[PDB]
Write a protein that binds this ligand. Structure first.
Ligand SMILES: [Mg+2]
Ligand SMILES: [Mg+2]
Ligand SMILES: [Mg+2]
Ligand SMILES: [Mg+2]
Ligand SMILES: [Mg+2]
Length: 45
RNA sequence: AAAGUUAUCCAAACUCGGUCGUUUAGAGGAAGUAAAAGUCGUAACAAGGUCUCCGUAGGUGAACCUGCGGAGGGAUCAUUU
């Protein structure tokens, strides 16, 4: 039995390249002030 | 005791030079405002199609472009061992 190793990276972007690669996107005026991380899907349908 | 006369003082006026202020002529050079049915491009306002702007330095017909350090008045108030 073998376990393939992992790889660890830390990418970091300017804002101009952040929303062209769809890392983040425009939010509404009221929804802007919400800094909780998005809830990742834990059921996947 | 009059004309006249000697030496100081108070001094108008003229001549030459210096200095300050106002007004005015000038070949040529370089800007601003307005008036246009002008010529050549399209820098900015939408991610204005290379995100925009600030200080500094260089370059190009013209708007402008590029290097170094900033700012968000941005196109992100946000990504977990
Ligand atoms: Mg003159
Ligand atoms: Mg003249
Ligand atoms: Mg431009
Ligand atoms: Mg802009
Ligand atoms: Mg704005």
């Amino acid at each position: 039995e073998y376990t393939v190793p992992k790889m660890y990276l830390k990418l970091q972007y300017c804002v101009s390249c952040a929303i062209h690669g769809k890392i983040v996107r425009v939010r509404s005026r009221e929804g802007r002030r919400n800094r909780a991380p998005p809830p990742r899907v834990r059921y996947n349908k």
